[PDB]
Amino acid sequence: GSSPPKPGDIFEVELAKNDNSLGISVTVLFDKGGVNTSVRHGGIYVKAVIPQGAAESDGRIHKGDRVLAVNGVSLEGATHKQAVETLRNTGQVVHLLLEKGQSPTSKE
Numbered sequence: 001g002s003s004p005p006k007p008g009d010i011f012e013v014e015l016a017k018n019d020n021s022l023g024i025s026v027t028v029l030f031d032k033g034g035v036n037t038s039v040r041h042g043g044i045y046v047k048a049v050i051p052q053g054a055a056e057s058d059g060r061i062h063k064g065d066r067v068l069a070v071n072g073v074s075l076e077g078a079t080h081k082q083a084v085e086t087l088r089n090t091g092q093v094v095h096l097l098l099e100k101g102q103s104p105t106s107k108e
Contacts (some may be wrong), residue, residue, distance in 0.1 A: 015058035023054020023088035036077025041068035069097040
């Protein structure tokens, strides 16, 4: 008993290294996507998913935001090893739990 959680809040992105399982540019809006930017869960901020799908296929959309866990690991400021590493290692098989808590508009 469950329901598919859509983006705009706590969204997770799962893909199995098959066709795509990543495709985002990190540190673009942030210093390294995941972190603990300023919350109690983490806080990945990015450009998000590539234009040609990829992570977008992984369904890891949202440029600049706050993740609870990345690649499955809770990036509550862990990054260094876990979160940042996942950004770089993403794809093999990625599972992400994100928490939508942006501020500015979708462009402004």
